[PDB]
Design a protein around this ligand. Structure first.
Ligand SMILES: OC[C@H]1O[C@@H](O[C@H]2[C@H](O)[C@H](O)[C@H](O[C@H]3[C@H](O)[C@H](O)[C@H](O[C@H]4[C@H](O)[C@H](O)[C@H](O)O[C@@H]4CO)O[C@@H]3CO)O[C@@H]2CO)[C@@H](O)[C@@H](O)[C@@H]1O
Ligand SMILES: OC[C@H]1O[C@@H](O)[C@@H](O)[C@@H](O)[C@@H]1O
Length: 562
């Protein structure tokens, strides 16, 4: 209770960031107050709310949150945050409609006393921002922004920093964004994570780490990147003797460390833990919900590999149902909600919950992973909602780093997933020790430039079905999509795609073979170098047999039905 107060409830001062702002931009209110509360993160101790109303009758009830300002510095190799001023409360709002808004502040503390501000008026002008990310109503396999443009996530996991903290994101994010990236994922647990809110406690949240997450979210805003926030990771509920980077013995949830839980199984049903978890959801909505750069709320990283002593499917399912309902109810902007599993096929009992707006796959497989990705993407079409391959690698043990310095594994996965019908690219691990130092971003740039012009929401793509390969030289396979106006092909050499020793292909002319498709000419055929990210050749065709030019590892082909 380092932040307690014991004074009569009074608003002392209010600062407003701007009186005029653009659609979907941040409107921030700072509130100085006194009151009676033992825990500023607990709404039963103090409840700050901002009540906003547009000129179309829509009302928004925005929870407020406790805030400490910091000034960051880099002490050679670690980030250091200096507190600036006393902590205070904030409200963060984002307007969906333009025009005028009225708002006021309401505060209630543990005594039952309630105080409020007068009403203030702000004006909202049109902006360039596309809005929040939703599931597409036109094609449930894909995401859209509120303004109807597609959101096709291209990026990687970038889940935590080194000791350099936000200074690492200063480096990684601009590199990702200038190479076609618009997506990453961050972890808000376990307590060692850069953005861990439950660092020393599950009752009070870490104001330094929350400030770091502010900073990174603001950088994503400047770079037009969209973030999945992963609230908790399985390690928190996994015993040391179970391996796999366990953390139960160190986690604040455990009674040994001051928490309410005698064992991780009790996480799902312990009344005190559920209360604190809802307080955390409220804090996250309060502090970050305004942002259109929050792509999704993700409850768990791999909840199926918590301790087997703790995984009771019926309880984990009910907890996801109840928390998704609660989170959706308090989130004024109704961000997408998801969860994840280490088991690649997932858990249908949980994945089919209506409150989870999209499903995910994690897969670390070294042999024939192209076929595995295709099979999992076909399988999870049964849920009739988008599918994100949220984690991908060769090997949970990290063999990728030395067996595949050129990123061919990442390459294979991002082309396979996009041209198999997934909502976006397979999302690689190893951002810090592999993608960045080996400068693998060019793979994303090539893929982004191939798909940028394609409107996946209107193409009605289906997996390519009725093709005939005529190739004698080699064993070529194809992953493809057939749409109303485009056919997109990724061809790969089955005997080269899984070998990682050779240099990046630096190809060339010759005829290799052909593929004929169930389509009607005339057509324009574009051959695309997937490593340089360039058109190689264009060809106008009068019939349905597509020549395949020579290529070393893989080749993309874009066919336009004229
Ligand atoms: O160094 C900072 C921080 O690292 C922590 O360990 C990390 C580890 O370095 C590595 O990045 C690991 O990546 C996992 C990650 O958990 C993914 O969600 C996913 O998972 C796997 C899981 O970890 C097991 O290996 C499991 O058997 O297989 C899962 C995949 O199916 O895969 C990634 C690659 O393995 O993440 C851990 C943390 O989870 C800690 O060492 C910490 O002390 C340290 O500060
Ligand atoms: O910023 C990402 C990485 O960049 C490198 O050049 C070093 O400065 C690392 O300390 C840092 O973690």
């Amino acid at each position: 209770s380092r932040y307690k107060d014991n004074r009569p409830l009074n608003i002392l001062g209010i600062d407003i960031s701007k009186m005029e702002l653009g659609r979907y931009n941040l409107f921030e209110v700072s509130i100085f107050l006194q009151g009676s509360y033992l825990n500023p993160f607990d709404p039963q101790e103090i409840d700050v709310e901002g009540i906003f109303e547009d000129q179309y009758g829509n009302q928004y009830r925005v929870p407020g949150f406790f805030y400490q300002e910091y000034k960051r510095e880099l002490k050679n190799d670690y980030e250091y945050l200096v507190p600036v001023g006393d902590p205070y409360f904030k409200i963060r709002f984002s307007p969906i409609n333009i025009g005028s808004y009225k708002f006021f502040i309401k505060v209630k503390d543990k005594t039952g006393r309630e105080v409020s501000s007068d009403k203030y008026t702000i004006y909202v002008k049109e902006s360039e921002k596309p809005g929040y990310i939703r599931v597409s109503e036109k094609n449930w396999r894909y995401f859209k922004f509120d303004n109807g443009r597609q959101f096709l996530p291209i990026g990687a996991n970038i889940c935590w920093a080194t000791s350099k903290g936000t200074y690492d994101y200063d480096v990684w994010l601009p590199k990702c964004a200038e190479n076609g990236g618009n997506y990453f994922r961050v972890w808000l647990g376990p307590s060692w994570a850069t953005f861990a809110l439950e660092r020393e406690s599950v009752k009070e949240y870490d104001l330094k780490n929350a400030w770091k997450l502010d900073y990174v979210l603001n950088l994503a805003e400047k770079l037009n990147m969209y973030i999945m926030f992963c609230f908790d990771s399985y390690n928190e509920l996994r015993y040391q003797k179970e391996g796999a980077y366990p953390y139960w013995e160190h986690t604040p949830h455990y009674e040994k460390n001051g928490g309410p839980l005698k064992e991780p199984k009790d996480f799902w049903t312990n009344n005190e833990m559920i209360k604190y978890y809802k307080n955390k959801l409220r804090y996250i909505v309060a502090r970050y919900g305004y942002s259109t750069n929050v792509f999704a709320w993700e409850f768990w990283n791999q909840v199926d590999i918590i301790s087997p002593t703790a995984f009771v499917i019926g309880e984990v399912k009910k907890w996801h149902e109840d928390m998704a309902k609660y989170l959706n109810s308090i989130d004024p902007w109704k961000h997408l909600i998801t969860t994840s599993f280490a088991f690649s096929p997932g858990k249908p009992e949980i994945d089919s919950i209506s409150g989870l707006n999209f499903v995910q796959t994690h897969i670390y497989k070294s042999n024939r992973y192209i076929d595995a990705l295709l099979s999992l993407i076909a399988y999870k079409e049964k849920y009739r909602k988008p599918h994100l391959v949220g984690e991908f690698g060769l090997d949970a043990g990290g063999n990728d780093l030395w067996v595949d310095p050129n990123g061919y594994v990442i390459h294979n996965a991002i082309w396979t997933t996009i041209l198999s019908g997934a909502s976006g690219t397979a999302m690689s691990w190893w951002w810090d020790n592999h993608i960045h130092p080996n400068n693998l971003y060019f793979h994303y740039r090539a893929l982004a430039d191939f798909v940028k012009d394609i409107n996946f929401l209107e193409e009605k793509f289906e997996r390519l079905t009725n093709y005939k390969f005529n190739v004698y030289n080699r064993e070529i396979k194809v992953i493809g999509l057939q749409g109303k106006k485009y056919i997109l092909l990724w061809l790969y050499n089955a005997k080269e795609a899984y070998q990682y020793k050779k240099d990046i292909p630096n190809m060339s002319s010759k005829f290799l073979g052909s593929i004929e498709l169930l389509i009607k000419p005339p057509i324009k055929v574009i051959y695309y170098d997937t490593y340089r990210g360039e058109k190689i050749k264009e060809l106008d065709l009068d019939k349905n047999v597509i020549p395949i030019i020579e290529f070393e590892r893989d080749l993309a082909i874009k066919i336009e039905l004229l």
